[PDB]
Structure 1
Amino acid sequence: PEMVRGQVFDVGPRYTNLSYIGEGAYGMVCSAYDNVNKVRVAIKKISPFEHQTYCQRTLREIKILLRFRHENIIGINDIIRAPTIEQMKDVYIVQDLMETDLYKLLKTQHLSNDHICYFLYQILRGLKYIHSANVLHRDLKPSNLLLNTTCDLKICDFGLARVADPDHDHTGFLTEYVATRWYRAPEIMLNSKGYTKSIDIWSVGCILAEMLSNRPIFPGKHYLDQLNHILGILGSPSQEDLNCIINLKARNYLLSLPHKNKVPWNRLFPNADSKALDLLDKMLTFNPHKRIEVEQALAHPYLEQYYDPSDEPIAEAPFKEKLKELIFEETARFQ
Structure 2
Amino acid sequence: PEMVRGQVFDVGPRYTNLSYIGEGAYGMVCSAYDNVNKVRVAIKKISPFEHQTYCQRTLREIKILLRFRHENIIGINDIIRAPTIEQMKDVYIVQDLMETDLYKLLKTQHLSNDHICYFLYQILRGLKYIHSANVLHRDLKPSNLLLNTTCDLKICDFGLARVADPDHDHTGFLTEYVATRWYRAPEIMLNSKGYTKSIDIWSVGCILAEMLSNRPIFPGKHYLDQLNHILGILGSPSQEDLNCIINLKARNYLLSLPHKNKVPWNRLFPNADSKALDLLDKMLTFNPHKRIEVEQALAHPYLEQYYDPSDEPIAEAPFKFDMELDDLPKEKLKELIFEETARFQP
User: How does the TM-score come out when normalised to structure 1?
Assistant: 0.99
- Structure 2: distance between partners of 1:282 and 1:158: 25
Structure 1 unaligned blocks of 5 or more: none
Deviations 1:148-173 (A, max 9, x none): 00100000001110000001000000
Deviations 1:260-300 (A, max 9, x none): 00000000100000000000000000000000000000000
Deviations 1:16-72 (A, max 9, x none): 000011114411000011111111100000111231111111000000000000000
> What's the secondary structure of 2:4's corresponding residue?
coil
Deviations 1:124-159 (A, max 9, x none): 000000000000000000000000001000000011
Deviations 1:89-139 (A, max 9, x none): 111001000000000000000000000000000000000000000000000
- Structure 1: distance between partners of 2:107 and 2:141: 14
Task: Indicate the larger mover: 193-202 or 49-58.
Answer: 49-58
- Structure 1: distance between partners of 2:159 and 2:49: 14
Q: CA deviation at 1:319?
A: 1.3
Q: CA deviation at 1:82?
A: 0.8
**2:341 paired with 1:323:** no
Task: Indicate the larger mover: 25-34 or 60-69.
Answer: 25-34
- Structure 1: distance between partners of 2:258 and 2:133: 42
Task: Indicate the larger mover: 312-321 or 281-290.
Answer: 312-321
Structure-to-structure mapping, 1:36-47, within 5 angstroms: 36-47=36-47
Structure 2 unaligned blocks of 5 or more: 321-330
- Structure 1: distance between partners of 2:57 and 2:30: 20
Deviations 1:172-219 (A, max 9, x none): 000000110000000000000000000000000000000000000001
Task: Indicate the larger mover: 192-201 or 311-320.
Answer: 311-320
Structure-to-structure mapping, 1:141-160, within 5 angstroms: 141-160=141-160
User: How does the TM-score come out when normalised to structure 2?
Assistant: 0.96
Task: Indicate the larger mover: 83-92 or 281-290.
Answer: 83-92
- Structure 2: distance between partners of 1:191 and 1:13: 51
> What's the secondary structure of 1:227's corresponding residue?
helix
Q: CA deviation at 1:234?
A: 0.3
- Structure 2: distance between partners of 1:277 and 1:331: 44
- Structure 2: distance between partners of 1:103 and 1:187: 25
Q: CA deviation at 1:254?
A: 0.3
Q: CA deviation at 1:87?
A: 1.0
In angstroms, what is the RMSD of aligned CA positions?
A: 1.2
- The number of equivalent residue pairs is 335
Task: Indicate the larger mover: 253-262 or 84-93.
Answer: 84-93
Match of 1:88 in 2: 88
> What's the secondary structure of 1:211's corresponding residue?
helix
- Structure 2: distance between partners of 1:89 and 1:173: 40
Task: Indicate the larger mover: 258-267 or 42-51.
Answer: 42-51
- Structure 2: distance between partners of 1:187 and 1:146: 28
Q: CA deviation at 1:86?
A: 1.3
- Structure 1: distance between partners of 2:63 and 2:25: 20
> What's the secondary structure of 2:177's corresponding residue?
coil
Match of 1:284 in 2: 284
- Structure 2: distance between partners of 1:236 and 1:293: 23
- Structure 1: distance between partners of 2:199 and 2:93: 28
- Structure 1: distance between partners of 2:38 and 2:189: 48
Percent of pairs with identical residues: 100
Q: Which runs of 4+ in 1 moved over 3 A?
A: none
